[PDB]
Design a protein around this nucleic acid. Sequence first.
RNA 1: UACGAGAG
Length: 442
Amino acid sequence: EKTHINIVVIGHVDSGKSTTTGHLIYKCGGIDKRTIEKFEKEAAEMGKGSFKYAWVLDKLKAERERGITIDISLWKFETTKYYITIIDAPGHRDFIKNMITGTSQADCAVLIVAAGVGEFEAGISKNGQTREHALLAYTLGVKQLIVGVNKMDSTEPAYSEKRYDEIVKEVSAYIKKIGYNPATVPFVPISGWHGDNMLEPSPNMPWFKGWKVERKEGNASGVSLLEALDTILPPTRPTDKPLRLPLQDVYKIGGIGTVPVGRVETGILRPGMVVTFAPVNITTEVKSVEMHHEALSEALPGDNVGFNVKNVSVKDIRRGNVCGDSKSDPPQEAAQFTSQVIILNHPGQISAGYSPVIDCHTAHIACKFAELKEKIDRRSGKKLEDNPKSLKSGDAAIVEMVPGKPMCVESFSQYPPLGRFAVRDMRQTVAVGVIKNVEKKS
RNA sequence: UACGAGAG
């Protein structure tokens, strides 16, 4: 009955994602040896070469393409604490689409960092995808990160302490820069080919006394990688964050008054709160909250409640408004926001000034594509062109949007229910993306 | 699961 966890394996090409994942699957005992050899021989027949530990993640990537799904029972294995399933990994056509749309959602990210001579340098170079992948993971809101320092068996001396520390520190400063505190990240020197250190201390690694992570939830320490997968925590509702409540409708009930209606996305709504409506900037008091024809002392995330407010007319507040706590991170109007989008099937080309309608939470406002900033490869997330001339179907890009009318939006990392939007033109959804940063208006 | 950018 162990709770389930979704894993995405990110990292630079040839850094050892597939090998590490496949060897982990082998050691975890999720697949019997006979079936393992059968699938190894199948892979050898399909492609020329040796696919030992490589057929697992490569097969997963190949089965996440062109909407063909036969079986996913192979990539489900059991740790001591959880049942963990490999979902997706970079290196296929639909990776970015699955990441942005959420069809492939992951609770924790396993960054495999190649660590031998020349590898750790290349992975973080201009052409390296390590930085791209970590930035994408942070953008998507995957705040739990595992760093596998892989193929370490290749230094001189064979397992260098200072090479490990070099990678660790130069990674740690950079992700302190982007937003992961290095203390919560477990670092483990491994070689996916050797199966080094995966489930028990490696005899080749006497100096690696163990890994230690310092988290707000408490410190944890270990040696092997299985324990790293055992450090993960379950998914949960945001019932401690500030209040956020998109307005779906506002009604005028005879003998009661104005009664906005919507679903609580984060935080708590209770009677007596002083609430602020954005972007209209209207502050009032909640007279009462009703759900299931009963008076509710508090409204939890997910509760679609209707609450009565005083001194506010129905013409004052409307659909698309975001309601929040007036004295705890209150909602505010968005002057502009920067988002990363992937262009779906579009009748033509997208240029600067393109102004489609944006559907964010319950809002429906036309936003102008002010600037076409960057063009991103949809296959690996690698930056291809800066300031592209135009965008077509299949192009991933980062653009700046200016709402044509007052709009209230949030970033995907902080308030996921209000950070993802859909771009629709005519009857077609031409693009879907997530918001990175928002410039709150005065 | 159909439907949906997602919640559902």
